[PDB]
Write a protein that binds this ligand. Structure first.
Ligand SMILES: CC(C)(COP(=O)(O)OP(=O)(O)OC[C@H]1O[C@@H](n2cnc3c(N)ncnc32)[C@H](O)[C@@H]1OP(=O)(O)O)[C@@H](O)C(=O)NCCC(=O)NCCS
Ligand SMILES: CC(C)(COP(=O)(O)OP(=O)(O)OC[C@H]1O[C@@H](n2cnc3c(N)ncnc32)[C@H](O)[C@@H]1OP(=O)(O)O)[C@@H](O)C(=O)NCCC(=O)NCCS
Lengths: 167, 167
């Protein structure tokens, strides 16, 4: 397999993989982003995310005829105390393609991106019940991040943003 | 007062304000970013954060002689299900300058940035004990975001990123 940066032509596959992950989490209907959205947000003049994809040889394409079997979606964030961070948002390899080393190589590639960008750390969320991914990550040096303990996450949605923008 | 995007010349003030906020939270020694860091990460060819600052007339500069009395530090993030988000990281107005409407105007400006960028929401963290800021935000339409419930935050620091990058 090959791990490489996605191109505008991979948007179809990125959305397909985003939906497979959402389905793995039983929330596929949550995905309202379109292929056009991904193209615009990812390969327009200012990318709001970056993506690496895992591509297999044609001989081994999926039953559906797709060459992309995994991906990682990330973007850079900033911490006022320490600086640049690489934030890994989505990370998924199709069932039939797991345990082959694809996820490990994607993480190695992300690590190189982090060092090239001089990020001091890579941050990400893992579901509490997912011991297999927790072990995967921790075997590669991850540790718990307590930074948000004692803090509540809030959102101000479009309706209210528009109200404030025009008050 | 004037709310405006920061310029490279404001880096000194941004670091000063970052430290005042850290001090308000009794963790000022946590701040290891330098002025040079902020200049490089914020006004170099690729900004890793954006900043708005609140500037007062010279007649009303701080006892230390500074014109900048508040700021908001933010960057854009991405959610694979809904797209673009505006993430507000730091938000602080100096004590003697609070309750004058500076924070409200900074949030209005951020809201305009969110709509201009077509972000569907603005996300941010607030300390559990800070009822005053919680009320401030909620009066302006904020609501709890449950997206991370059942999830653990993890980090892979530079040491381990370097190890994986070179394995
Ligand atoms: C691991 C994951 C993140 C993607 O990666 P992946 O391609 O399966 O994983 P890798 O093949 O590199 O394998 C990791 C392992 O395979 C085993 N492995 C790796 N290469 C192997 C090979 N060539 N032969 C046999 N076993 C191998 C190892 O035991 C490592 O397990 P370890 O976790 O105990 O250290 C996958 O669980 C995925 O999509 N999982 C479901 C979604 C998910 O949990 N995502 C992250 C958070 S929501
Ligand atoms: C509000 C905060 C975020 C910055 O903003 P600010 O300039 O003080 O606030 P504003 O002046 O726009 O005032 C908000 C209020 O002032 C009062 N107010 C606003 N303009 C006013 C005026 N001209 N005259 C009198 N009262 C006024 C209102 O009651 C509003 O309170 P409300 O919160 O109940 O809706 C400030 O608390 C700050 O730095 N706080 C400490 C750090 C912090 O908590 N940061 C966020 C998270 S770590």
């Amino acid at each position: 397999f090959v791990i490489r940066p996605a191109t505008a032509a991979d948007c179809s596959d990125i959305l397909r993989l985003i939906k497979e992950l959402a389905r793995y989490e039983y929330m596929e209907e949550q995905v309202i982003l379109t292929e056009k959205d991904l193209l615009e947000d990812g390969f327009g003049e200012h990318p709001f995310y970056h993506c690496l994809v895992a591509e297999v040889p044609k001989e081994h394409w999926t039953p559906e005829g797709h060459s992309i079997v995994g991906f990682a979606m990330y973007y850079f964030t900033y911490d006022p105390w320490i600086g640049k961070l690489l934030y890994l948002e989505d990370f998924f390899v199709m069932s039939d393609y797991r345990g082959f080393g694809i996820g490990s190589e994607i993480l190695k590639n992300l690590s190189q991106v982090a060092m090239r960008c001089r990020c001091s750390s890579m941050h990400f969320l893992v579901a509490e019940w997912n011991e297999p991914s927790i072990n995967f990550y921790k075997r590669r040096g991850a540790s718990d991040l307590s930074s948000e303990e004692g803090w509540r996450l809030f959102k101000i949605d479009k309706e209210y943003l528009l109200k404030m923008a025009t008050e």
